[PDB]
Amino acid sequence: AEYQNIFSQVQVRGPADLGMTEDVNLANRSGVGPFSTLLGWFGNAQLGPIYLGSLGVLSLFSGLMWFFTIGIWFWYQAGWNPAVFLRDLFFFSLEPPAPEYGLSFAAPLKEGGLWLIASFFMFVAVWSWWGRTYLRAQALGMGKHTAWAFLSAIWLWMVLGFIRPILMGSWSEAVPYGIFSHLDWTNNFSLVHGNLFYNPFHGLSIAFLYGSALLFAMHGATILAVSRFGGERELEQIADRGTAAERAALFWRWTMGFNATMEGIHLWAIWMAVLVTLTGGIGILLSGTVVDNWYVWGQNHG
Amino acid sequence: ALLSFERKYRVPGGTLVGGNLFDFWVGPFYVGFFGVATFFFAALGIILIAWSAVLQGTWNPQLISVYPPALEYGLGGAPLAKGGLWQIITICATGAFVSWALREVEICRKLGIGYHIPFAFAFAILAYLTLVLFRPVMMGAWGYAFPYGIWTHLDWVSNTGYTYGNFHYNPAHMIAISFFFTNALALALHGALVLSAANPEKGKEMRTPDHEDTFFRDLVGYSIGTLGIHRLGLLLSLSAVFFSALCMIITGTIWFDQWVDWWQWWVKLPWWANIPGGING
Amino acid sequence: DLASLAIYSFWIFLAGLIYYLQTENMREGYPLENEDGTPAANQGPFPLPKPKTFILPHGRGTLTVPGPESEDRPIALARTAVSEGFPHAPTGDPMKDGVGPASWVARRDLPELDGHGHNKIKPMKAAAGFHVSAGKNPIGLPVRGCDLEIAGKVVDIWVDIPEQMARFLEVELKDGSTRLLPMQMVKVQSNRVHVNALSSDLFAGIPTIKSPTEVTLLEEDKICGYVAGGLMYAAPKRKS
Numbered sequence: 005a006e007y008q009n010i011f012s013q014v015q016v017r018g019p020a021d022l023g024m025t026e027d028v029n030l031a032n033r034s035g036v037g038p039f040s041t042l043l044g045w046f047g048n049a050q051l052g053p054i055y056l057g058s059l060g061v062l063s064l065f066s067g068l069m070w071f072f073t074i075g076i077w078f079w080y081q082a083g084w085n086p087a088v089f090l091r092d093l094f095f096f097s098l099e100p101p102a103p104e105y106g107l108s109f110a111a112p113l114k115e116g117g118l119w120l121i122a123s124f125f126m127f128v129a130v131w132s133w134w135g136r137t138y139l140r141a142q143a144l145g146m147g148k149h150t151a152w153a154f155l156s157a158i159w160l161w162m163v164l165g166f167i168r169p170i171l172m173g174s175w176s177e178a179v180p181y182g183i184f185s186h187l188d189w190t191n192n193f194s195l196v197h198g199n200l201f202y203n204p205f206h207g208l209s210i211a212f213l214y215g216s217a218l219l220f221a222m223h224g225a226t227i228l229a230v231s232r233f234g235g236e237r238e239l240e241q242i243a244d245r246g247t248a249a250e251r252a253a254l255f256w257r258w259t260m261g262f263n264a265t266m267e268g269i270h271l272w273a274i275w276m277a278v279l280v281t282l283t284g285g286i287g288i289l290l291s292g293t294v295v296d297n298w299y300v301w302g303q304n305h306g
Numbered sequence: 307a308l309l310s311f312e313r314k315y316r317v318p319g320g321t322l323v324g325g326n327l328f329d330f331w332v333g334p335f336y337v338g339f340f341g342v343a344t345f346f347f348a349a350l351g352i353i354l355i356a357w358s359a360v361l362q363g364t365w366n367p368q369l370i371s372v373y374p375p376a377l378e379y380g381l382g383g384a385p386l387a388k389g390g391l392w393q394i395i396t397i398c399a400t401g402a403f404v405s406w407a408l409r410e411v412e413i414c415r416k417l418g419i420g421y422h423i424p425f426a427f428a429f430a431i432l433a434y435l436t437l438v439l440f441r442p443v444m445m446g447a448w449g450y451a452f453p454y455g456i457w458t459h460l461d462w463v464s465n466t467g468y469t470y471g472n473f474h475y476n477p478a479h480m481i482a483i484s485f486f487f488t489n490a491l492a493l494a495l496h497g498a499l500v501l502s503a504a505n506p507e508k509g510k511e512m513r514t515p516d517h518e519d520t521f522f523r524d525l526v527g528y529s530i531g532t533l534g535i536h537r538l539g540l541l542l543s544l545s546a547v548f549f550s551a552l553c554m555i556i557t558g559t560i561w562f563d564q565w566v567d568w569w570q571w572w573v574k575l576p577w578w579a580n581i582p583g584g585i586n587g
Numbered sequence: 588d589l590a591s592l593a594i595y596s597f598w599i600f601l602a603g604l605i606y607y608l609q610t611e612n613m614r615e616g617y618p619l620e621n622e623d624g625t626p627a628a629n630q631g632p633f634p635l636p637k638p639k640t641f642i643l644p645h646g647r648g649t650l651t652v653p654g655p656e657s658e659d660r661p662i663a664l665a666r667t668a669v670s671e672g673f674p675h676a677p678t679g680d681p682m683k684d685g686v687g688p689a690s691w692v693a694r695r696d697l698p699e700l701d702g703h704g705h706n707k708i709k710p711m712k713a714a715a716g717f718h719v720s721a722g723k724n725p726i727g728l729p730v731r732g733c734d735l736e737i738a739g740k741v742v743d744i745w746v747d748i749p750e751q752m753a754r755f756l757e758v759e760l761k762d763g764s765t766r767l768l769p770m771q772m773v774k775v776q777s778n779r780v781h782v783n784a785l786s787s788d789l790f791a792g793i794p795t796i797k798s799p800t801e802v803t804l805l806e807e808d809k810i811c812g813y814v815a816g817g818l819m820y821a822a823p824k825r826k827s
């Protein structure tokens with residue numbers, strides 16, 4: 005019947021776009037890559053350019069080092085044969101050093117030295133990408149929102165493999181690198197702490213994670229519903245409110261009694277999401293450092 | 307009671323049933339025929355929960371819980387105190403939810419916008435119906451549904467999962483999780499983009515969609531664009547719930563053994579099934 | 588103990604955040620008003636936020652919200668009841684008068700500029716390099732309305748340079764004038780473009796634009812308003 009705007013019904017190409025300059029060192033941007041017509045039905049066809057640079061290359065190089073480090077191991081676990089590597093892919097796993105070695109870096113590779121090595125690489129890979137996240141915004145003179153939000157994700161991660169292990173007394177507390185094994189670690193973690201469904205933070209994380217799905221459905225469907233008045237053009241709707249934004253507010257006001265503004269909704273969005281990993285990380289951090297068993301704690305409340 | 311620009315939008319029209327009878331607001335609330343329908347079903351349901359609270363012997367909201375009829379009743383009616391109340395309430399819920407969706411559709415016609423919102427809400431209603439209606443039915447008893455209380459409802463999650471071992475291994479459940487984690491990642495990113503363009507460094511001027519696209523290309527080498535990120539949000543979200551329904555409708559009906567064992571198909575391909583070594587041989 | 592300290596703090600934080608989070612979402616539309624324009628008695632529990640100011644990319648200025656709110660236009664509606672709460676009937680032709688699903692806001696009568704100061708939306712003819720890459724090209728197709736009759740023909744595609752995106756089709760009418768029609772409200776088919784919202788006789792009514800190679804925020808609103816309104820107000824001619 006009516007069009008719905010989920011896929012473009014006509015594409016349109018023009019010169020590769022090399023983007024804004026503001027204070028950016030143009031010396032670091034690649035060339036523009038090809039144009040995908042595939043992507044082009046859902047969003048923008050242009051691939052590239054990307055901007056590499058010291059931190060980007062630093063990040064990216066460690067990225068692979070961690071990736072491959074784990075990969076060597078898997079290869080070794082297979083005893084070198086492809087058929088096997090493929091067969092047991094999800095079953096290999098690179099595990100932290102045994103409790104026995106505490107927090108030291110003295111464990112043999114096979115007893116976890118590798119684990120530390122890979123971790124090390126991931127550590128630098130991530131923070132270097134974090135800084136890149138800030139730097140790339142400074143050049144364009146944009147606020148530091150993306151960096152602040154990315155910190156929240158970093159938080160959980162940092163808590164799971166670094167902070168909690170330090171406070172427990174050993175790397176053996178950290179997560180092993182493996183598809184099925186990190187799943188198992190997860191399950192195991194709840195069993196040993198008395199069932200995470202009793203962790204008040206755990207369940208506040210669920211709320212935000214469900215929350216985000218609900219909010220993005222809400223938002224996204226709303227912007228599509230008023231895209232026949234230019235709705236997706238959010239920044240200008242912020243500077244000069246149009247009927248897209250009015251009808252968007254009012255649909256919600258008539259539905260549930262209150263609404264938002266075009267800038268306000270993004271504020272709701274950035275916080276709904278950010279709180280998923282923020283509470284989630286408190287959740288894990290208090291587990292087994294201060295609370296051994298969420299069932300018990302919940303009977304007392306401390 | 308009116309936003310400074312609201313009046314020109316409050317015109318007659320759009321209702322799906324009732325013509326002009328229910329075409330009005332109460333405060334900010336649009337009403338409509340379905341406005342009325344949802345109040346009916348909501349009040350009713352609420353009363354029945356309260357009632358159910360007396361047979362149980364509590365008013366404590368952290369203990370009140372309405373259970374489905376026990377398995378012995380299969381797909382049949384059941385005495386109030388033993389699961390009939392849950393049965394009626396469930397009719398009531400469905401009544402409320404679906405009524406809300408159509409009330410939404412009416413708000414849509416009046417405002418001249420598209421139907422994307424009610425439509426996304428329908429995926430949610432469908433997740434609920436999978437758990438309380440469809441799964442039970444293909445399975446042979448309301449008893450497999452889940453109960454209405456804050457904590458008891460969690461216990462059902464936990465027991466039902468552990469009945470198949472570590473539920474992590476349901477393959478449709480892994481997909482579904484993926485989309486949840488992904489949708490959350492996109493939400494943080496969108497919120498953060500638009501705001502950092504709207505709120506740039508102290509003293510600079512408002513940035514532009516162009517900066518938004520630039521920022522992303524600079525960083526990851528691609529940018530989906532302002533219309534695309536909204537298309538994507540909608541999609542990640544609806545997809546997650548879709549896979550949730552899926553991972554559950556197959557569990558207990560076509561697969562009833564431990565989810566971990568299901569992965570043996572992979573491991574037992576004749577090409578590698580015997581080869582010594584690795585983890586599984 | 589710690590945990591319960593942490594969880595109790597968290598709820599207090601959360602309430603501050605909702606408070607925040609809500610007042611920030613009051614920068615438009617408030618204070619509430621009565622069906623007549625006067626300020627409402629209950630504005631509710633949250634105060635209006637302290638003002639904030641955006642600058643305004645290309646010498647275009649400043650915006651401060653909350654700020655004096657005013658339709659800067661006449662609204663042709665009349666009450667249908669003696670009390671708060673009912674619909675306001677259109678006192679003339681809602682398509683022309685710009686009320687209901689045909690409303691528009693009085694945005695600025697300048698066009699949106701890309702990041703470089705250039706008009707964001709140009710007709711394809713004036714957009715160097717821009718061509719159609721995938722999907723049927725509408726240029727050339729006849730345009731049909733919801734009453735199954737032919738209103739005109741496509742003669743160009745107005746595109747969004749920076750987002751590389753079709754935004755309008757420009758359409759030629761019986762008399763040789765053109766109109767903009769939003770991409771989002773048309774259905775491109777193989778032997779024609781179809782418009783559900785409007786009937787043939789309503790195309791002439793679509794607001795025209797003043798310069799022929801640019802559109803303003805004010806005109807995009809009048810055009811989009813006018814055509815969404817057709818869904819409701821042209822239903823009598825819509826058939827299928």
Ligand code: BCL
Pocket residue numbers: 161164179183184186187190474479480481483484485487488
């Ligand atoms: C949250 C608490 C648990 C946990 C619980 C779960 C559960 C439960 C599940 C996963 C699932 C996933 N987890 Mg885990 N996960 C945890 C922490 C992590 C961390 C981390 C660095 O902290 C990482 C990288 C992963 C990685 C992953 C992915 C393999 C998989 C889908 C992720 C996804 O959609 O990302 C979001 C989207 C993105 C675009 C980010 C980037 C995507 C790519 C794929 C990242 C993967 C790198 C990967 C290891 C390469 C795989 C090797 C190849 C197969 C050759 N988990 C913690 C310890 N995770 C799901 C799964 O399918 O497991 C099999 C699943 O069901």
Ligand code: BCL
Pocket residue numbers: 206207208210211212214215218352434437452456457459460463
């Ligand atoms: C979805 C998979 C499982 C399930 C798994 C889990 C897990 C796991 C957890 C929850 C948790 C929650 N679930 Mg549950 N939950 C299920 C089905 C539902 C249904 C339903 C009708 O389908 C409802 C209403 C709820 C409601 C809830 C909330 C009480 C709590 C936090 C929700 C949240 O933030 O959502 C996101 C939505 C929003 C932010 C919008 C606001 C919604 C509000 C908060 C709804 C409250 C309703 C009220 C308590 C109950 C009805 C009141 C009467 C009608 C009058 N669940 C199904 C059975 N659910 C979490 C918890 O902490 O429980 C103690 C938790 O850890």
Ligand code: BCL
Pocket residue numbers: 129130157158160161190191192193194199200201205206209210211213280281283284285287288463487490
């Ligand atoms: C059965 C086992 C337990 C259980 C054990 C745990 C444990 C343990 C944890 C969770 C956690 C979570 N669980 Mg639980 N969980 C259970 C049941 C549930 C149920 C349910 C219906 O039952 C739900 C809905 C949830 C939901 C959740 C989330 C709200 C929360 C994960 C947040 C997140 O996004 O992490 C995903 C995000 C990250 C891991 C951050 C990613 C960070 C880094 C920087 C990304 C790096 C990428 C890297 C560099 C490589 C790139 C890849 C390549 C480039 C491709 N759980 C049961 C009861 N759950 C987590 C939590 O916070 O608990 C408080 C957690 O640790």
Ligand code: BCL
Pocket residue numbers: 190191403430431432433434436437462463464466467468472473474479482483486547549550551552553554
């Ligand atoms: C120990 C338990 C098992 C487990 C067992 C299960 C089981 C069992 C189930 C899930 C389900 C899910 N689990 Mg699992 N799961 C585990 C570990 C995890 C982990 C993890 C981090 O380890 C994660 C991230 C998840 C993630 C998920 C999601 C894919 C899916 C939940 C969302 C959903 O269905 O929404 C769908 C959303 C809804 C159903 C909400 C509908 C709301 C309705 C329509 C409207 C509400 C109105 C309301 C009353 C409001 C009124 C309020 C006021 C009046 C205003 N699981 C562990 C290993 N998981 C569930 C699923 O897939 O369900 C289909 C499910 O049943």
Ligand SMILES: C/C=C1/c2cc3[nH]c4c(c3C)C(=O)[C@H](C(=O)OC)c4c3nc(cc4[nH]c(cc(n2)[C@@H]1C)c(C(C)=O)c4C)[C@@H](C)[C@@H]3CCC(=O)OC/C=C(\C)CCC[C@H](C)CCC[C@H](C)CCCC(C)C
Pocket residue numbers: 063064066067068071129130131133134137150153154155156157277278279280281487488490491494495526
């Ligand atoms: C609520 C909070 C949410 C949230 C939020 C945010 N999340 C962000 C941001 C925000 C705000 C960013 O700004 C930032 C970003 O930039 O986005 C584009 C980022 C990021 N979130 C990533 C992954 C992620 N977030 C998860 C979770 C949540 N996030 C939750 C839900 C999860 C889950 C769910 O597990 C995952 C897996 C990375 C994509 C990215 C950093 C990558 C990095 O630091 O990499 C370091 C760079 C490398 C390691 C290169 C390594 C190459 C890889 C390992 C493999 C090789 C390539 C390939 C396999 C094939 C070729 C190899 C070949 C040669 C053989």
Ligand SMILES: C/C=C1\c2cc3[nH]c4c(c3C)C(=O)[C@H](C(=O)OC)c4c3nc(cc4[nH]c(cc(n2)[C@@H]1C)c(C(C)=O)c4C)[C@@H](C)[C@@H]3CCC(=O)OC/C=C(\C)CCC[C@H](C)CCC[C@H](C)CCCC(C)C
Pocket residue numbers: 214215217218221222225259260344347348349351352395398399402403406410423424426427429430453454455456459543544547
């Ligand atoms: C599809 C992908 C996402 C998505 C999408 C969308 N979600 C939407 C919309 C869209 C698009 C709307 O447009 C609509 C809305 O307006 O939003 C403000 C809506 C809504 N999503 C709500 C809850 C919600 N969404 C969830 C999930 C997702 N949503 C996912 C993740 C979850 C999760 C995760 O659990 C929850 C809890 C309500 C707030 C609101 C309905 C109000 C209602 O229908 O009023 C009508 C009903 C009542 C007022 C109460 C009737 C109560 C009965 C009679 C008595 C209680 C019975 C009950 C079984 C008791 C159980 C208790 C419990 C402990 C077990």
Ligand SMILES: COC(C)(C)C(=O)C/C=C(\C)CC/C=C(\C)CC/C=C(\C)CCCC/C(C)=C/CCC(C)CC/C=C(\C)CCC=C(C)C
Pocket residue numbers: 071072074075076078120123124126127161162163164165166179180181182183186
């Ligand atoms: C195909 O063959 C080749 C060789 C090409 C390959 O490369 C194949 C490679 C593979 C098969 C790769 C497979 C890789 C994986 C599946 C990896 C999976 C990883 C996860 C699921 C990870 C999940 C969680 C990890 C977490 C939470 C780690 C966090 C780490 C840290 C916070 C790091 C803390 C740092 C430490 C302990 C070191 C600090 C040291 C100092 C000196 C400060």
Ligand SMILES: CCCCCCCCCCCC[N+](C)(C)[O-]
Pocket residue numbers: 204205207208211215275276
């Ligand atoms: C920013 C959005 C605010 C939404 C908050 C929703 C509240 C969810 C209620 C969670 C209650 C569960 N528990 C155990 C943690 O209390």
Ligand SMILES: CCCCCCCCCCCC[N+](C)(C)[O-]
Pocket residue numbers: 261262605609630631633
């Ligand atoms: C998940 C959290 C839900 C938060 C709900 C907050 C309700 C605030 C109501 C705003 C008041 C609207 N008024 C009356 C200002 O229009």
Ligand SMILES: [Fe+3]
Pocket residue numbers: 223227238270496500536
């Ligand atoms: Fe947006």
